[PDB]
Structure formats: C-alpha cells, structure tokens
C-alpha cells in the first residue's frame with residue numbers, strides 16, 4: 001500500500017563535474033532512527049547547487065544536490081517527535097542539533113553537525129540513503145532535495161504551517177531567509193536608518209525587505225543592471241544607483257548621499273572588491289557592513305585595517321543568522337500573516353524534469369528564482 | 375598675580391621630523407570663549423606621539439605633542455560651565471562636541487570635531503594658542519600636553535575627582551581606557567568566556583583587566599617575549615602562550631586550547647598578520663575579534679572573506695569605544711573605588727625635562743609606561 005520500505009523515484013543525479021544532471025531512477029531506503037522521509041512538492045534552484053556542478057563547492061560525487069525546498073512527510077523513523085506523516089516541512093541545510101556549543105549560544109546558528117565545512121555527503125550515521133542501480137549516491141548537505149523523495153535527519157527538518165503554499169514558501173529554505181535574516185538578525189537594522197545593498201538579485205531583494213520590515217527609512221539598492229531596479233523598488237528600495245553612470249567611485253557617491261555614510265551596507269553579490277567597497281560606504285564611526293555571500297572558491301581580498309579602527313563592524317553569517325529549526329517555522333507564520341510577499345522573487349516555475357533548463361536560466365541570465373515543481 | 379593673560383613656560387617642541395624634542399620657552403595665550411587653560415601635573419608617553427616624530431602620523435609641524443595626561447585648571451574662557459579653576463581634569467584627544475551625528479549615536483564615540491582624520495593642528499577656531507619666540511607652534515589633537523601649560527576646548531576636557539592622584543590616573547587619558555574599553559565596551563565581553571589578547575604591552579595589559587572586570591573566565595595572553603608574561607598574569611591573564619615555542623601556527627594551537635576557538639580575541643600589537651591570526655583563533659560561528667590599534671602607516675592585509683561568513687565579527691574603535699566626556703570621569707570614580715589598579719602599568723616616572731629619555735625607553739625597549747611629571 002504505502003511506505004515503510006524502499007521507494008523508487010526519479011532524482012537528478014550528478015555523476016561527474018561540469019556535466020548536466022541526469023534524471024535517473026533511484027531507490028530511497030526507509031528512514032532509520034531519527035530520520036524522516038519526505039516527498040518533495042517543490043524545490044528552488046540556488047547559485048550554490050551550481051557551484052557543486054563546477055567543482056568550486058567540493059563535495060563527494062555522484063551526488064543529489066538541491067537544499068532549497070518544501071515538502072510533505074511520508075514516513076518517520078524511530079524516535080521521531082517533531083514531525084508526523086502528512087506534515088508540511090522544509091529541509092534544513094543548516095541543522096539544529098540543539099545541543100552543541102553553537103546551538104546553545106544565544107546568537108550562534110552554524111550548528112556543528114553541518115556538512116559544508118568538511119562535506120561527507122552522508123547522513124548523520126555516515127551512510128547514504130540513496131543508490132542508482134547498484135551504486136550508492138551521496139547526499140547534499142543533509143537535504144538532497146533534487147529527488148521526488150529524500151531522507152533527512154530530524155535536526156535537518158522543520159515542521160511548518162499545514163496551510164502553507166509549498167510552491168512559494170520553499171524560498172524560506174535558503175534564498176529568502178538568507179537575505180531577510182542578514183538585515184533583521186545579523187545587521188540588526190534599526191528604524192529610520194539608511195541601508196545600502198550591493199546586488200539586486202534574489203537574496204539581494206530579500207535583504208531590501210528585511211531592511212523594510214526592520215523599519216529602515218532609506219534603502220539604496222545598487223547594481224550595474226538598470227533592469228533589476230524596478231522589482232527592488234517595488235519590493236522596498238527607495239533608491240537605485242548604477243555605479244556605471246557615475247564618473248567617480250560609488251563608495252564616494254554613496255557617502256555623499258548618506259552624508260557620512262550609510263548605517264548598514266550588505267554585499268549580496270559575493271565580489272571581493274565590492275566586499276571592500278561596501279565596507280567603506282558605511283558610516284565610519286558606527287557603520288555595520290554584512291557579507292551575505294562569498295563564493296566557495298573565493299580568494300583573499302586586500303583591505304586597509306584603518307577602516308575598522310574608526311568604529312566600523314564587519315560580519316558574516318550563514319542562513320541569515322537564523323537558528324534554523326526555531327525560526328523557519330516563524331517566517332512561514334509571518335508570510336501567512338500577509339506580512340511579506342515571496343512572489344516578486346519567483347520568476348520562473350518549471351516541471352522538475354526540466355532541471356537543466358532551470359540551471360541555464362540561472363547560469364546565465366535573469367531568472368530571479370526558478371522553482372522546480374514535482 | 376595670577377593669569378588672564380599670556381603665560382610663559384617650557385614645552386617640548388618638535389620643529390622637524392625625526393629630530394628630538396627641544397625644550398623651549400613658549401607663550402601660552404589666554405583661553406578664548408569655550409576654551410580652558412590647564413597646568414599639567416603629569417603626562418604619559420604613548421607610541422602615537424612617537425609616530426608624529428617619525429612622520430608616520432602626519433600632522434602640521436612644528437608641534438607640541440602629548441595627549442595622555444591629567445592636570446589642574448588655571449583659568450577658563452567665556453561661556454565655560456563644565457569646569458572651574460582649581461578642578462582636576464584630563465584633556466580628551468577624542469572630543470565630545472555632544473551634538474554631532476556620532477555624539478548623538480548610542481554607540482558612536484569618534485566625535486566629528488576630532489583632529490586625527492585630517493589634522494589641522496589648531497584649536498576649534500583654527501588658530502594656535504602657542505608661539506616660540508615669534509613663531510606660532512601647532513597643537514596636537516586638541517591636547518598638546520607636552521607643555522607646562524596648554525589650552526584646550528571645552529569638548530576636549532573632562533572634569534575628574536578632586537582626590538585623584540594625577541600621576542597615576544593620567545593613564546585613563548589614552549593607554550588604559552583604550553585597552554580596557556576595547557574589552558568592556560567594544561567587544562562587550564561576557565562572563566565565563568574565553569579571551570585571547572595578542573600583545574602583552576601596556577594597552578594589552580589594559581585589555582586583560584577589562585576582560586577580567588568583564589567577568590571572563592579564561593584569559594590567554596600571547597606574546598613572543600616571555601618577559602612580559604608575569605605582569606599580565608599578575609594583572610589577570612590565566613595563561614600566557616609564546617608562539618615561538620610551538621612547532622605549529624598558534625591560531626591552530628589557540629583553537630585547540632579553546633576547543634573551537636576563543637569567544638573574543640584582541641590584537642593590541644598592530645601587526646597585519648597578527649590581525650588576521652587573531653581573527654581566525656575566534657570561534658568560527660559566533661567569535662568576535664577586535665583591533666585595538668593599527669599603525670598610521672599601515673598597509674593592506676590579505677584576508678579570506680570566508681572567515682566572516684561562518685558568523686565571526688571584526689570591529690575596531692578609538693579610545694576604547696568610550697564616549698570621552700561621559701566616561702573618563704567614571705573610570706576615575708571606579709579607580710578611586712579601588713576597583714582596578716594602574717600601578718603595574720607605570721614602569722617609569724621621569725621629570726618632564728628628560729622627555730627624550732622617555733622616548734628612548736619607549737622607542738626601544740621595555741618600559742611598559744613612562745610618566746612625565748611637571
């Protein structure tokens with residue numbers, strides 16, 4: 001009838017680097033103790049899944065990527081208590097073991113039981129829940145959501161509102177929370193403040209919303225593509241500056257506009273130079289700059305430490321600084337409240353079989369966000 | 375009888391770069407509106423006064439340096455209300471105009487009316503209160519304390535406790551507050567935490583005390599001079615590590631000891647490399663590293679931004695992050711309380727006429743702190 005045993009579905013497998021995804025037939029073993037098996041309803045395509053493909057983000061291959069999705073619980077293993085079959089959920093790429101040095105810390109969120117630091121591409125027990133033909137296939141993070149079914153550990157799953165449109169809230173899985181959290185939890189934006197966001201992409205758009213929910217009073221969005229300027233404005237940016245029309249460094253034109261410099265700056269592109277530029281357009285005495293992302297293959301940036309000496313702060317974070325298991329559920333509750341919208345972000349919805357087409361839209365172009373539906 | 379007119383005293387003048395101080399006879403004009411004239415009782419010799427000498431710290435010459443001192447008020451100009459003649463005071467190199475964008479900010483302390491950003495070497499009105507023979511001599515910061523008399527603006531002076539030993543509390547003028555504040559106000563050390571302090575000098579010693587007052591539970595002091603290890607221990611460090619005996623990078627031996635890394639790290643040497651090293655020995659998910667000092671002639675440091683992405687913070691500050699006019703007075707009150715001691719810092723007391731000898735002790739050697747008495 002149901003499941004309590006091996007399943008057979010299609011999943012997008014990466015056998016080799018820089019090769020497309022091969023839609024294959026795989027077997028998904030039943031959940032062991034404290035594991036949960038989920039049937040995917042939708043998964044978004046994020047830059048990091050693409051790194052894996054390039055070999056930039058180094059994790060054991062073949063693998064089953066994806067980490068930004070929402071689904072419905074099919075079956076739960078022994079000792080599980082946070083979810084029940086039928087429950088809407090969101091796989092968590094940043095766990096919440098809830099008892100490490102970091103989980104217990106009032107601010108920390110990068111659970112020690114994560115798998116990006118030193119990826120293993122397995123489950124918490126060190127075995128894989130996947131095989132294609134006779135070959136085991138590795139997990140991605142603790143999610144591997146580019147499969148019709150996946151198994152995740154209980155500290156890597158969040159139970160959400162049962163009324164949740166899983167085709168839209170899947171965003172809270174990475175893209176949206178990463179940006180939004182950077183503003184409201186990491187930089188801890190104050191109201192009346194002036195903010196600058198470098199990069200008007202999806203995560204970028206997310207920050208501008210956090211800055212807005214946060215109460216900010218002025219949000220300058222900066223990008224060298226005039227095209228991205230409308231949604232940003234529509235979603236929250238009060239200004240949009242294209243550094244390509246100025247005849248001077250924009251850190252300069254930025255400090256001039258902010259009359260001393262912005263209160264908080266966000267670098268959501270991942271560029272080294274822009275990393276330093278965003279640092280300097282921040283008010284020298286009490287400005288806070290946040291790095292939302294740095295490519296897995298990033299090199300060292302040159303910086304003058306006198307930049308920090310005045311009184312400036314430089315932070316980083318993963319997953320918008322949010323305690324994953326505790327917060328994901330609340331972001332949904334707020335989305336449900338009518339609080340924020342997620343629609344201006346979804347620019348494309350494709351059937352899951354057309355994954356490689358999703359990556360093309362992504363890889364080169366403008367597709368703010370492509371959602372793969374199962 | 376008294377003063378309400380020009381005074382004639384000796385001051386240590388720097389006519390040219392990399393030339394010793396020449397004890398000369400200068401005339402100190404009476405305080406104009408909102409100025410205060412102070413008779414120096416003692417002034418400490420700090421690294422930054424020496425930068426000036428080297429040309430590293432670029433300010434208009436000839437000048438009358440010094441900025442770390444305490445004294446007694448002789449006469450006050452028009453509109454003055456915070457001090458009365460006879461009052462013990464401490465000149466403030468970081469003003470508190472009390473009404474700028476930064477003074478009004480709940481955290482900011484680098485008043486916009488300071489003179490290190492773009493030094494003028496004058497008073498707030500843009501004229502000099504000094505002349506040697508017929509030649510005007512420039513001010514240093516808004517202090518110029520290497521004179522038997524000096525004139526400072528009212529936002530650059532702090533009224534302290536009348537019972538205050540001015541030969542010891544002069545420290546609160548730079549050295550002590552710069553370190554102490556870095557721990558208790560900038561990093562905002564929490565109790566039970568583990569801290570690491572790179573540099574076991576005077577300011578360095580000051581941080582270890584702030585970390586201690588702060589409630590910390592473990593303070594590793596690191597320096598490549600076994601000699602500095604006793605006072606540090608005596609003043610607060612629970613451990614002292616000399617990176618020269620290890621066969622591995624100490625960021626490594628540091629993370630090993632802290633089992634993940636220290637909660638807060640302080641770089642009080644001013645070295646680029648050590649700047650990066652201190653950043654990495656901090657707990658990756660929620661570690662906070664503070665730069666207490668960077669030489670005026672510092673170059674760019676190479677750094678991998680992935681260091682910040684985990685969740686680490688990097689701050690800087692000037693004058694221990696303290697709102698100068700508001701806080702100096704309290705540090706004295708606390709010192710008076712019997713709270714902390716300032717004695718283990720003063721390693722030498724010389725008569726003011728032997729200034730150049732003070733710089734020698736400083737320039738090359740071990741003299742934790744040399745106090746010049748008038």
Ligand SMILES: Nc1ncnc2c1ncn2[C@@H]1O[C@H](COP(=O)(O)OP(=O)(O)OC[C@H]2O[C@@H](O)[C@H](O)[C@@H]2O)[C@@H](O)[C@H]1O
Pocket residue numbers: 047198199200201202203204222223224225228243268269270271274292293294295
């Ligand atoms: N030199 C530049 N100056 C300004 N804007 C730039 C520059 N180079 C690129 N951009 C802009 O930055 C944006 C990049 O975002 P996307 O490519 O659309 O990707 P997004 O998902 O929004 O951000 C991905 C980035 O953020 C990090 O979290 C992640 O690691 C990755 O580095 C685009 O709007 C692009 O025009």
Ligand SMILES: Nc1ncnc2c1ncn2[C@@H]1O[C@H](COP(=O)(O)OP(=O)(O)OC[C@H]2O[C@@H](O)[C@H](O)[C@@H]2O)[C@@H](O)[C@H]1O
Pocket residue numbers: 421572573574575576577578596597598599602617642643644645648666667668669
């Ligand atoms: N590579 C190194 N590793 C470890 N310790 C070092 C190293 N190089 C120097 N030190 C130690 O750092 C200390 C330097 O402090 P001092 O020279 O005594 O000067 P201090 O006043 O304590 O600090 C001055 C420094 O701090 C900044 O606020 C200021 O701008 C200046 O750069 C000494 O104990 C010295 O042995």
Ligand SMILES: [Zn+2]
Pocket residue numbers: 095096097098099100101102103104111112113
């Ligand atoms: Zn944990």
Ligand SMILES: [Zn+2]
Pocket residue numbers: 046047048049067068174175
């Ligand atoms: Zn992602």
Ligand SMILES: [Zn+2]
Pocket residue numbers: 469470471472473474475476477478485486487
């Ligand atoms: Zn001010």
Ligand SMILES: [Zn+2]
Pocket residue numbers: 420421422423441442548549
């Ligand atoms: Zn000083």
